[PDB]
């Protein structure tokens, strides 16, 4: 079966000099994930429940 799931709002990104800062506004616990595209990735995990930076 297929279930309708909510889509989170696009985070607000301010570009720093090889820095990346995002505003996170979740209505509910939301999973944020990123990894590096190079030889040695550094994956991340955190469940976001409030506004964080």
């Amino acid at each position: 079966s297929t279930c309708r799931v909510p889509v989170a709002r696009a985070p607000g990104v301010t570009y720093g000099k090889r820095e990346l800062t995002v505003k996170l506004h979740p209505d509910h616990p939301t999973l944020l994930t990123y990894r590096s595209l190079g030889a040695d990735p550094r994956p991340y995990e955190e469940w976001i429940d409030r506004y964080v930076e």
């Binding site: 990104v13 570009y15 720093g16 000099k17 090889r18 820095e19 990346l20 994930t33 990894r35 595209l37 190079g38 030889a39 040695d40 990735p41 994956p43 995990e45």
Partner: protein
């Protein structure tokens, strides 16, 4: 025509391979990677899923006695209990107060939806790479798919193309692979027949159509309470559900080189690592003669503006003199910059513009238009955005030109120091010569 080239294993980047054929006008070719797939070989070890504890109704031998019977059943338990006095709603089930036995029997069976809900343990080895390549040269523009090894040739407009084997044997999958639906995990699953209760692999089955099932769930049987028919038993919970709610993230979230892991079949796509050697077999029909190709002379290169950004932030103005209009092939013989266009319109005005991408402050790349030669020198600038959503279109060369301002100052300092050192050497040499003279 025999020609070999090496291209990066990057999707969305068009390599420009240039053929200098002797008797014909030069031709520049578009090598575009549309998408790759690293395809490992999977050896299924066993199938793991939730189990099912089947507890039939207990036989209660009213004023009598039975013995336990062994059964060829996985994780089978059979305990007889004497002295039982059960009760029902209407009253006492058996007749004698203490002369009674109850037969407790329980076992583990494959769940009804292992056919649906299960995880497969695999071994991955000998990953086979297959890539999608677009060839567009001259007047043709075609796309074909070929296995990336020195043993596959695909026809492209009469041409024999063979992409020789992946530069590196790197793979994102480990020896042991566990696949659940669309997720792949690098997990050391326990060997077959050595599973522990409460962990992944507590029950193991070789195949979905397997008849033999291994179960190690530490099933235990205990006395029923007085006046109750309930078949007490304490058993370890399923390790499959424990793994499901302790699996975490899959290989898609930790794969290096930006690999995208998919299943059906298990594969890693668009990994950006290594080089793809290319062997080319171009016939005569594709090339053009120099008698019909324009003759380009007096080519100078002057540069108005250049920025060493990820995109083609360099702008090059070329001046030349031709006899007839037509189409030249343009190439950069230096990795410092890469020209965006491979063939431009050649007309009478004798001036053409080019877009190039560089990464160095003072690039020195060389541009050839048809058979002409010239040197392009520029001062590129640090760009505007700290972050862009597209990859770099250059080769990431940051060494400045031998004649750049920084290298100019370095060379001036070195020349002055060397002049002083050679003057001192000459003075000492002359002095020593005079000393041995006297």
């Amino acid at each position: 025509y025999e020609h070999t080239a090496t291209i990066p294993n990057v999707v969305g980047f068009p390599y420009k391979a240039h053929i200098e054929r002797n008797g014909f006008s030069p031709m520049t070719l578009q090598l575009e990677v549309l998408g790759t797939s690293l395809e490992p070989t999977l050896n299924l070890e066993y199938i793991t899923c939730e189990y099912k504890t089947v507890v039939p109704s207990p036989y209660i031998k009213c004023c009598g006695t039975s013995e336990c019977r062994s059964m060829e059943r996985p994780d089978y338990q059979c305990q007889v209990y004497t002295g039982v006095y059960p009760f029902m709603w209407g009253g006492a089930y058996c007749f004698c107060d203490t002369e009674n036995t109850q037969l407790s029997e329980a076992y583990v069976d494959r769940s009804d939806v292992c056919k649906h809900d299960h995880a497969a343990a695999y071994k991955a080895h000998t990953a086979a790479m297959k890539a999608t390549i677009r060839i567009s040269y001259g007047n043709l523009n075609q796309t074909t798919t070929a296995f990336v090894n020195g043993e596959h040739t695909v026809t492209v407009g009469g041409s024999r193309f063979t992409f020789g084997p992946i530069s590196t044997a790197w793979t994102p999958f480990d020896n042991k692979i566990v696949v659940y639906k669309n997720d792949v995990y690098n997990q050391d699953f326990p060997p077959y027949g050595s599973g522990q209760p409460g962990r992944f692999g507590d029950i193991q089955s070789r195949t979905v159509e397997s008849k033999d099932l291994y179960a190690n769930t530490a099933l235990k049987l205990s006395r029923p309470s007085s006046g109750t028919v309930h078949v007490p038993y304490t058993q370890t919970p399923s390790g499959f559900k424990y793994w499901l709610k302790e699996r975490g993230t899959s290989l898609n979230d930790k794969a290096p080189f930006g690999c995208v892991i998919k299943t059906n079949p298990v594969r890693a796509e668009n990994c950006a690592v290594g080089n793809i050697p290319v062997s080319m077999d171009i016939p005569d029909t594709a090339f053009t003669r120099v008698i019909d190709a324009p003759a380009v002379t007096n080519l100078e290169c002057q540069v108005a503006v250049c920025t060493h950004s990820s995109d083609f932030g360099g702008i090059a103005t070329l001046t030349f003199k031709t006899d007839k209009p037509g189409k030249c092939a343009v190439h950069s013989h230096s990795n410092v910059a890469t020209i965006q266009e491979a063939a431009v319109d050649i007309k009478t005005d004798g001036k053409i513009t080019l877009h190039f991408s560089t990464a160095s402050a003072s690039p020195a790349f060389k541009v050839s238009v048809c058979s002409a030669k010239t040197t392009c020198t520029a001062a590129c600038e640090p760009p505007k955005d700290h972050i862009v959503p597209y990859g770099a279109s250059h080769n990431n060369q940051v060494f400045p030109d031998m004649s750049g301002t920084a290298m100019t100052w370095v060379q001036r300092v070195a020349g002055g120091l060397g002049g002083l050192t050679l003057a001192a050497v000459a003075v000492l040499i002359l002095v020593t010569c005079v000393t041995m003279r006297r």
